[PDB]
Amino acid sequence: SRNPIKYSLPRLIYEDLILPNYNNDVDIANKLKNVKFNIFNPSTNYELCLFLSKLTGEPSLNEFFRVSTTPLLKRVIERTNGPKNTDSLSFKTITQELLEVTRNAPSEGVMASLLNVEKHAYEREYLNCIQRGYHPNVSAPPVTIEVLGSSHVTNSINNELFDPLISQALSDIPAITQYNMHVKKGIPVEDFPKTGLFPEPLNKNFSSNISMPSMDRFITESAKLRKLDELLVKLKSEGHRVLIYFQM
Amino acid sequence: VTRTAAHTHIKGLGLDESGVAKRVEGGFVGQIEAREACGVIVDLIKAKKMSGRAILLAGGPSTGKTALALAISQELGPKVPFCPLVGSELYSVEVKKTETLMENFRRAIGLRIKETKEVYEGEVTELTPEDAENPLGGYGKTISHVIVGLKSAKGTKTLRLDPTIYESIQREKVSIGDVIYIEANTGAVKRVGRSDAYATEFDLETEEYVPLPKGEVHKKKEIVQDVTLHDLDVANARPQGGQDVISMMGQLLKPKKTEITEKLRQEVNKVVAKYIDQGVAELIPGVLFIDEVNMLDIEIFTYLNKALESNIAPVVVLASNRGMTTVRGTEDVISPHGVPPDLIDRLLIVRTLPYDKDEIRTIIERRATVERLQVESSALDLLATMGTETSLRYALQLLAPCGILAQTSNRKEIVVNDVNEAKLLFLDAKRSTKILETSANYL
Amino acid sequence: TRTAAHTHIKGLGLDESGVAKRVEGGFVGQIEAREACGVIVDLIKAKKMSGRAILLAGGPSTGKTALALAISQELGPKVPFCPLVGSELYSVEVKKTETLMENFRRAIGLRIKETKEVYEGEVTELTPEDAENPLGGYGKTISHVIVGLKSAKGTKTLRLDPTIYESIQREKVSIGDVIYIEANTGAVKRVGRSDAYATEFDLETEEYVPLPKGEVHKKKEIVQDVTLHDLDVANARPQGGQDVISMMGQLLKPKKTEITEKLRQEVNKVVAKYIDQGVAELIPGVLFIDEVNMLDIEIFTYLNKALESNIAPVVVLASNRGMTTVRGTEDVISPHGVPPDLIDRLLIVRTLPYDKDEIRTIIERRATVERLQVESSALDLLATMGTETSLRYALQLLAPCGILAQTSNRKEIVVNDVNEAKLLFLDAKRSTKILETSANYL
Amino acid sequence: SLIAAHSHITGLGLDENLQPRPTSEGMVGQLQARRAAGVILKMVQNGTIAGRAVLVAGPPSTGKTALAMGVSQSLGKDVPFTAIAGSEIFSLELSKTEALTQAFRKSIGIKIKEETELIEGEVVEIQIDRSITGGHKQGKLTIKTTDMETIYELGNKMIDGLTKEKVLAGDVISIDKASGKITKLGRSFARSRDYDAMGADTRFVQCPEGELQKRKTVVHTVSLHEIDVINSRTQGFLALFTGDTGEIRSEVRDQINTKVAEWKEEGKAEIVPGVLFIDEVHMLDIECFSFINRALEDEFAPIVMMATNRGVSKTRGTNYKSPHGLPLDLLDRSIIITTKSYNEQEIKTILSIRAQEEEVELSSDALDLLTKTGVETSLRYSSNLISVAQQIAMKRKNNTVEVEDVKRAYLLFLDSARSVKYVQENESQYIDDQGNVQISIA
Ligand SMILES: Nc1ncnc2c1ncn2[C@@H]1O[C@H](COP(=O)(O)OP(=O)(O)O)[C@@H](O)[C@H]1O
Ligand SMILES: Nc1ncnc2c1ncn2[C@@H]1O[C@H](COP(=O)(O)OP(=O)(O)O)[C@@H](O)[C@H]1O
Ligand SMILES: Nc1ncnc2c1ncn2[C@@H]1O[C@H](COP(=O)(O)OP(=O)(O)O)[C@@H](O)[C@H]1O
C-alpha cells in the first residue's frame, strides 16, 4: 500500500543537509552538541551525576546521559523496573502504595474493589456485547516520499516506517516460534524482544473498521421475514414440524 | 408512536412543476415569495455548476428562516450533503476559527466513488510460521513468512505472507477454524467469526458463527462509496489504516484538529480531479447552512470574503434576525442584519414576511394534527388569539400541556377551560416581564 | 525550632461545655468568635452535616486565619483539613470549576480497616519437586513447591501452589533472600538479602535488610486512611497494564484532566456499599479558603451549586473587605466581596479588633514563644508602637530587637534596642509619608 | 448518608389528577408551580415530544432547585437527569458549544436489550495453556452440575478472569456469557489435602442441580454521550472517566444517530428521553443561548428546564439588559413558571420538616421564634440556625432545643443585613473599594 500523494524532493537537499559528507559538518556538530557539551557526561560533570544519583537513587551514574540521548518510544519500550536503594530522596506516594498492592488482589477485597470501579462499570453495563456504531469514511497511509535516484532514501524510509523493534513491540511472537527460540536455540526469556504492547480493543467488534453485512439488518428489513421469525421461536418451542412454500 | 420536536411537519417547499408555490403544501403556510426563491436556489444547486453563491434569510423571529433551511435540505434529499451550523460553532479551543470555517466549507463538498477492492477471504485451515536464522540479530524480523491455508466454497488457496500482514492478522487474534477477511488494499484484516462447520455449543466467548464465504478466495468487488473532501483531508492529515509504524501510532494518540495546510488541499484536489477524469469519481456539491450568522465576529466575515471566491466553494445559506446592529469585534461599524457591507454586497437577501391571524390558526391546525391531538374549534380560535396576541411559538408550545391536562381528566378533546388552566399554569415572555417590573427582590 | 507568624496557638482553648477562657491555648480576646469556632468544631465532630458553609469576617490583623488554624488543631491530624488561597483556583491547565471540585473532594476522608495474613522471613530452602506421574513432552512437571522460611524465633517450611514458582522466577528469588508472602494472592516479592550474607563479596549493589522480627506467620489488622480525591485520581488514571499508552503517560507530564461526575458517582456508591458492610468509615473535614473576595463570580456560582451536594464538607471562608464590588462584575455592591446569593447560604461571624492589653499579651506571648527576653518598659513601648502603627508591625519588630541585643552581647531587649529597630525599620504609614513628601519618584 | 439541603424532598407530592397536596413528599405550598412541575414530569414521562425549554423564575430562597430535585425524584430510576450549573460550560479543553452538546447528549437515554446465558456449576478440571511469554492463552474448562457434565473452550478474557479470584477445581462458580463476570459462589468439594498458604475460608455452598446453561434476557441503560465517547477513539472507555473527550467530530455524531435509529427500527434498542437541568442559566454567554436556540430544534434533544434568580439584568457577552438575564429569542421558545414568596405558615412547615429531617426536636415557642426570625430575615438563615442551636442544646446536656439555645445561636451568628449594618459604621477597619484602611486603633 502506497499513498497517492507523492512529495517529490531533490537529491541535493538530502545529500547536503541531512547526510554527512566531507563538505559539511552535520556529524561534527551532532557530536559537539550531544556528546562533548552534554551536561550529563560523567567525564566532565561527575558532580552533577552524583547529585542526581543521590536524588533519584539510580544504581548507575551513566543512566541520565543514556536517557537524554535516546528517543521517547525507545525509552518506553525497554524501561525495566530495576531496584533502587532505600537511602535516597525518592519516596513512595499514597497513590502508588494503593496501586502496588492491588495488582494481583482478587475480588471481595476492600482495596481491590475500591480501586477497580472502572472494571465494575465495564461488566455492569455489558460493554463486551455492544455493536460498533461509527467507522471512518476515508483511511489513508502516511504520505510517500520519492527521491529520484537514491537508495539510501528508500532504506531510511523503510527503516523508519517499518522499525523492527517497534513492530515487534506492537505485536506478539507466535508460540511455536517462542518455543523454537527458547529451548531449540538456548535464548532465555529475559533476552526475548519486548512484545504485546498494543492495547486491547474494547470488543471483538472494535478490533477493525471493516463491518460485515449484518444478518440482523438482513432479516429486519423485510417485515414478512420478521413476522416469520416472530412465529418460528414459539413454533420451535412447541416442538413442531413446519413446511414453508415459496414461488421464487 | 413517534417523536416530534418543533419540526418534521415540513417535508419540502411544496412547489408545482413550474416553480409556483402552492399556499398549503409540504406543511408550509404562506411565505410564497420566500419559497419561490428557495426553489430557485434549489434548481441552482441541482444544476451543480456554480461555486461561491450565497443567500441570506432575513426576517423577524418565528417567521420560518430555519424551517426554510430544513425545507431545502429535505428537497435536495440525503444524497446531496447538507451541513447545518451555528455561528457559535466556529470558536474552537483547539484550532483557529478560520480553520474551522474552512473545514466546514470542505465538509459540504461530497464525492461519489466507485472503488474496487481486492479481497482474500475464507476459513483458516493451517497457520504455520517459518522462523528466522538469527532472531536476535538486531535488524530483521522474528519470522520470515507465514503460510495460511484459506478454503472457501468451491475453492482452496495457500497464502504465503510477509511478516507485516501477519502482524495485523495476529492483532485480531485469529486461530485455526476462523474465517477471515484480508482486504488487500490497506492490508487491514477482519476476524469474521468462527465457522459453523465445527461445533457451536462449546464456547464461552459470546461468539458468532457464520457459514463459509461463497465464491473463490481471491475476489475483486465494486463498492460505491460516498465521502466528502474534508474526510480526505482528515485522513491524509492524521494517517491511519496502513501497516506501518505511524499508522499504528496514529490510532492511539488523542484526536485533535490541526491547521490543515493549503498544499494538502491542493494535492487532495489534484488526486480527486484525476479520479474524476478517469471516469471513476463524481462530484456532489452541497449546502453549508449557518444559522445565526450575526454571532460571527468580523474576522470570520473577512475570511468569508475570500472563501466565497474560491473555486470549490459550496452554496452557503445564512440566517439572521437583526435589523441594524453593530458587528461583533467592532465598535462603530453599524450594519444591517449584523452582517458587514463588504460581504452583504456579495449576498442575495431573501425577505421573510410575518404571518396573519388565519395563517397562525392553520399553523396551529397543522401542529395539532402532527402531534396527534384533537382540539375544539373554540379552543382553536382561542389559540389563534394567543398567536396574534403574544407569540406564535407560545401558542405552538402550549398544545402539549393542554393535551396532558385533557388526558389527566380522562378526555381526548381539548376545550377552552383547558387553555384557561394552561394560561394560569404557564406564562409567556410579556407576562413574565410584567411581573418582573413590579417585583420586590429581582423576581 | 522554627516559628513563622503562628505556632503559638494550640487549638481554641474552650473549657468543658462552656465559654472560651481568657488566656489559654495562645488565644486572647475574641470570645464570641472562639465560641462560634468551637460550636462549628463540635458540629464537624458530630459528622452529621454536609454542605454547611461559614464565613468569618473583620479587619486585617484580627485573627481569622488564626481561628481557622485553631479549628484545624482542634479537629486533630486525622480529620482532613485543606487550606487554600482564593487565587489558587485560577489554574491554566484545567478549568477552575474542576479545581474547586477537586479541593471539595480533597476534604473528605476515609478510615479503612483491613486484616492481612502475611508470611515473611529469610529463604533457607526452596525447591519445587516433580509430580509422581510426569507428563510427556514437558520438563519439570511440578506438583507443589516447598519453601522454607526463617525469622526471629521463627522457622517454618510450607507447601505452595506450583504457579507461584513462575513468579519466583520472575522475582529472582534464591537462598538467602527475604520474601514477602501475602496469603490469598500468592504474588511473591523480594525485599533484599539477610545481613549474614552481607560480606560475601567485595563489590555488590544489593541492599542488606535485616531479618524481620516476630514469627514467619502473623495477622495484623492494618488501618489505612485515604481521601476521596486520591481514589478519584487512582481510578481515573489506568492501573498496571501492558499497553504502550500507560507507560507512555507515565513518562509524560501528568496533565490535570476534567474528572467527570460518572466516576465520582461510582466511587461514592462503592464507598457507600463498603460503609454499609461496616468496613470503611467516612470522615468529613474542612475546606478553608481565605481571601474569598478574590473568587470570580463563576466560581461563586459553582459554590452556590455545590454547597447543596450530599458530600460537601464544611467550607470556611475569610475576607477583610466591606462594601466592595465582586470581581468579574462591575455594578453590584456586596459585603465582604461575596455575592448575596452565596451570602444567604452561610453564617457570618464578626471578629472584633484588639486593645492595648490584648496587644501587650500578644507581644509577651510571641516574645516567650520566640525564646526572647524583653523588659517591661520595652514591652510598654512595643504596645504603644503596636497601637500607634500596627499590631503586625509590633509582631515583625521583635526578632530585629533580639538580633541587635545579641549584637551588644545582651540576653535582654532594652528600649534602646527597640528605638534602634524603629529607626532602622519603617512601617506602612511612615513609608507612605516619605512617599508623599518626595518628588524623586520615591 | 449525610444530610444535605434537598435531602428532605422525595417526590413531588401529587395526586392522580396532578393536584398537589398542601403537605406531601417533603414539599409544602407552591401549588401552581408544583402543578406545572407535574405537567412537565408527565410530558417527560410520555416521551411523545422533545426539546421544550422551561424557565423556573423567582427570588432567591424560594424553592427552585427544590422543585428541580422533586422533579428528579419523581422521575424515578432508569431516566437520565443531567444537573449542571452555568459555570461548567466555560472550559479550557472544550468550546462552549461542545460542552453544551455533551450536556445535551448526556440526557438522552438508550435502553438496549441483550440475550445472556448464565452458566453455574461445580468445576471439575481446568486446563489452561499459556505460551512462554504468557501472552497467548487458550484452554478448556470442564464444569458439571448434578445432571449434566459439559466441557468448554476458554478465551483470553475468560482465562484472565479465572486467574483472578483463584479457582481450585471444586469451587462452584457462576459465569455470565454476555457480561463476562466470574463469580465464585463458594466451595462444595471440601478438599482435605491443601497447601496451607492461603487464608481461604470459603463458604460451604451446595452443588447446583438442574440445567447447566440458562438463557436470560437483560436490559441495560446507556446514554448517547457514552456511545459517542466509546466510538470516538481507541481508548474511549478511559475517556469516560478522565473526561479527555476533546471536541468529538460531527461525523461521529451523525453516524451514531443513524446507528441508534437503525437499532430502534430493529427492536433491539429503545430511546428514552430525560431532563437537562441548567441551574443559574444567567451565568452563560450569548453564544450559549444562540447555540441552545438551534440545538433545541433537533430530534435528539431532551426537555431542558433552567432556573434564574436574577431580575432584568445584563446578558453576558453583550451590553444590554434583558428580562431574566436571557435574550428575547430564547424567551420566545420557552414557557415560564413563576415561583412566589412564602408566608409565615409555609416557612413554619419548612422549618418543621427540616427539623424532622435532622432528627432535631424543637420546642413550640422555639419554632415560633425561628419562624419570626425567618420572616424578618431570610428563610435559609433560620434553617441553618437549627443545627448550631442543636449543637448548643447538647452542649447544655439536654436533648431539646430551647429558646435560649436558638437565641444564643442568633447572637453568635449573623445575617446579611446585620453584617452590612455592623460594617457600615466601622468602615475604617475594613478595606474599602479603594484599598484604604486604618489598621492602627489610635
Ligand atoms: N410557513 C410555515 N408553516 C408551518 N410552520 C412554520 C412556518 N413558518 C414558521 N413555522 C414555524 O415557526 C417556528 C419558527 O421557525 P424557525 O425558522 O425555526 O425559527 P425563526 O423563524 O425564528 O428563524 C418553527 O417551529 C416552525 O415550525
Ligand atoms: N486572639 C489572638 N491571640 C493571639 N494571637 C493572635 C490573635 N489574633 C491574631 N493573633 C496573631 O496575629 C497574627 C496575624 O493575624 P492574622 O490571622 O494574620 O490576621 P487576619 O485574620 O486579618 O489575616 C497571627 O500571627 C496571630 O498569631
Ligand atoms: N416548597 C418547598 N419544599 C421543600 N423545600 C423548599 C421549598 N421551598 C424552599 N425550600 C428550601 O429552600 C431552599 C431554597 O430553595 P432554592 O431552590 O435555592 O430557591 P431558588 O429557586 O431561589 O433557587 C432550598 O434549600 C429548599 O430546601
From Swiss-Prot, chain A:
Signal sequence residues: none
Organism (species): Saccharomyces cerevisiae (strain ATCC 204508 / S288c)
Coverage span on the entire protein: 1077 to 1324 of 1489
Compartment(s) where it occurs, according to its Swiss-Prot or TrEMBL record: Nucleus
Extra remark: Present with 1110 molecules/cell in log phase SD medium.
Summary of the function given for this chain in its UniProt record: ATPase component of the INO80 complex which remodels chromatin by shifting nucleosomes and is involved in DNA repair. Its ability to induce transcription of some phosphate-responsive genes is modulated by inositol polyphosphates. The INO80 complex is involved in DNA repair by associating with 'Ser-129' phosphorylated H2A histones as a response to DNA damage.
Entry remark concerning the domains of this protein: The DBINO region is involved in binding to DNA.
Quaternary state and interactors: Component of the chromatin-remodeling INO80 complex, at least composed of ARP4, ARP5, ARP8, RVB1, RVB2, TAF14, NHP10, IES1, IES3, IES4, IES6, ACT1, IES2, IES5 and INO80.
Protein known as: Chromatin-remodeling ATPase INO80
Membership in a protein family: Belongs to the SNF2/RAD54 helicase family.
Swiss-Prot record, chain C:
Record flagged with keyword tRNA-binding: no
Cellular component per GO, a single term: NuA4 histone acetyltransferase complex
One biological process term in Gene Ontology: regulation of DNA-templated transcription
Binding positions (ATP): G58, G59, P60, S61, T62, G63, K64, T65
Principal location: nucleus
Any one Gene Ontology molecular-function term assigned to this protein's record: 5'-3' DNA helicase activity
Locations listed in the record: Nucleus
Catalytic activity: ATP + H2O = ADP + phosphate + H(+)
Family stated for the protein in its record: Belongs to the RuvB family.
Quaternary structure note: Probably forms a homohexamer. Interacts with RVB2 and may form heterododecamers with RVB2. Component of the SWR1 chromatin remodeling complex composed of at least ACT1, ARP4, RVB1, RVB2, ARP6, YAF9, VPS71, VPS72, SWC3, SWC4, SWC5, SWC7 and SWR1, and perhaps BDF1. Component of the chromatin-remodeling INO80 complex, at least composed of ARP4, ARP5, ARP8, RVB1, RVB2, TAF14, NHP10, IES1, IES3, IES4, IES6, ACT1, IES2, IES5 and INO80. Component of the R2TP complex composed of at least RVB1, RVB2, TAH1 and PIH1. Interacts with SPT15/TBP and HSP90.
Name of protein: RuvB-like protein 1
Curated annotation (Swiss-Prot), chain D:
Chief localisation class: nucleus
Catalytic activity of the protein: ATP + H2O = ADP + phosphate + H(+)
Cellular compartments per GO CC: chromatin; Ino80 complex; NuA4 histone acetyltransferase complex; nucleus; R2TP complex; Swr1 complex; TTT Hsp90 cochaperone complex
DNA damage as UniProt keyword: yes
InterPro entries per UniProt: AAA+_ATPase, P-loop_NTPase, RuvB-like, RuvB-like_C, RuvBL1/2_DNA/RNA_bd_dom, TIP49_P-loop
Record: residues binding ATP: G58, P59, P60, S61, T62, G63, K64, T65
A GO term, aspect molecular function: DNA helicase activity
Database matches in Pfam families: TIP49 (PF06068), TIP49_C (PF17856)
Disulfide bonds: none
Family from the record: Belongs to the RuvB family.
PANTHER family, per the entry: RUVB-RELATED REPTIN AND PONTIN
Extra facts: Present with 3030 molecules/cell in log phase SD medium.
Known role: DNA helicase which participates in several chromatin remodeling complexes, including the SWR1 and the INO80 complexes. The SWR1 complex mediates the ATP-dependent exchange of histone H2A for the H2A variant HZT1 leading to transcriptional regulation of selected genes by chromatin remodeling. The INO80 complex remodels chromatin by shifting nucleosomes. Its ability to induce transcription of some phosphate-responsive genes is modulated by inositol polyphosphates. The INO80 complex is involved in DNA repair by associating to 'Ser-129' phosphorylated H2A histones as a response to DNA damage.
Subunit-level organization: Probably forms a homohexamer. Interacts with RVB1 and may form heterododecamers with RVB1. Component of the SWR1 chromatin remodeling complex composed of at least ACT1, ARP4, RVB1, RVB2, ARP6, YAF9, VPS71, VPS72, SWC3, SWC4, SWC5, SWC7 and SWR1, and perhaps BDF1. Component of the chromatin-remodeling INO80 complex, at least composed of ARP4, ARP5, ARP8, RVB1, RVB2, TAF14, NHP10, IES1, IES3, IES4, IES6, ACT1, IES2, IES5 and INO80. Also belongs to the R2TP complex composed of at least RVB1, RVB2, TAH1 and PIH1. Interacts with SPT15/TBP.
Record's protein name: RuvB-like protein 2
Annotated gene: RVB2
